[PDB]
Amino acid sequence: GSELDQLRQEAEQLKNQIRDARKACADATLSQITNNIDPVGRIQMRTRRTLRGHLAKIYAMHWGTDSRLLVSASQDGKLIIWDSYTTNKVHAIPLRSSWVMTCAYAPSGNYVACGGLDNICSIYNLKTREGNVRVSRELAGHTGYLSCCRFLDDNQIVTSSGDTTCALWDIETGQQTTTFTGHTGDVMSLSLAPDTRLFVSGACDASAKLWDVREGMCRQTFTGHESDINAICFFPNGNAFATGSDDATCRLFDLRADQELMTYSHDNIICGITSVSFSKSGRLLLAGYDDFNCNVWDALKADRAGVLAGHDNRVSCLGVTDDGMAVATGSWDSFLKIWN
């Protein structure tokens, strides 16, 4: 009655004034500000390593904090930990349930985090006296399938599940320390910050929201998309972030002001983004696609500057190493490739 109609009319005026404030502060575009700078030349990249040994599709990959070791996760039920510079393997951890979609490497190189469609999470330990791998925790309590999970510290982890929620957990306690809710679809990916302390996430309700890690409530919301958000990445500076989608329109947003800056798109692409990663300068914005190749795009000019077509099936995971000397791509054809 009066309560409900007053409440949503007040929400209407609040939304209108928020949109007015968003429009007022926008005076130009990144293209206008950077209309005088040399375009990046044609980028040539060649495969240097052809890591093989998986017998199913590849769904995730995460670089270590040393640029020496990788992690994969196939549907065969394996969590091979590769070792670059040699192509040899160092671990062949077998999973319990062969339904995995996430990976995580600890920043100190001690533990590995895994989790898929079985509604639980696992933390395997590497540095042990036995010289093997043993499950130390089996964090459970979610309702939907886990979409992503990235380490926050050596004793703190954060996860996002398909029941419109995220959870900041606590290892060695097995308790959901913090809960984040508000989404209406399902959180498909999230990214951390260079200094942590904040994290952004995206769902299938055509939205992208930022969350603090202490008080536990959404700060702002960034709409604009017309499709699902199944990929996200954070700028190294910490004041902007990219966003993929299933309709091949990469977006670049701003934390300081909720604005639309870039609209990365073309006319010969009708597929969907799968992964997005930045570089130290934040100039070469890599991206994945369903049309069997990865197209690296310049961020400032918002135009194509190279194609990494070397795969057979859809690319599913993509990653830039920490210091930066190569990138890793993994598709459904059971092949990991190292471009440089």
């Binding site: 929400a11 500000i33 002001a257 800056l261």
Partner: protein, 58 residues
């Protein structure tokens, strides 16, 4: 009634978010491109790397 609580917490979120400050997109992009230009000297991805400094080389 769950709907009234949903609406009231939604409007509380909206009004508490409305108090955030806003910045000029032009100067934000200026700092963005300044950082991009500054932290690009080595950048072994876009800058060509010598063969002797290429670990991923046989």
């Amino acid at each position: 009634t769950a709907s009234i609580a949903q609406a009231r917490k939604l409007v509380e979120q909206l009004k508490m978010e409305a108090n955030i400050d806003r910045i000029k997109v032009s100067k934000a992009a200026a700092d963005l491109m300044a950082y991009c230009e500054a932290h690009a000297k080595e950048d072994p991805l876009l800058t060509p790397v010598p063969a002797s400094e290429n670990p991923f080389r046989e």
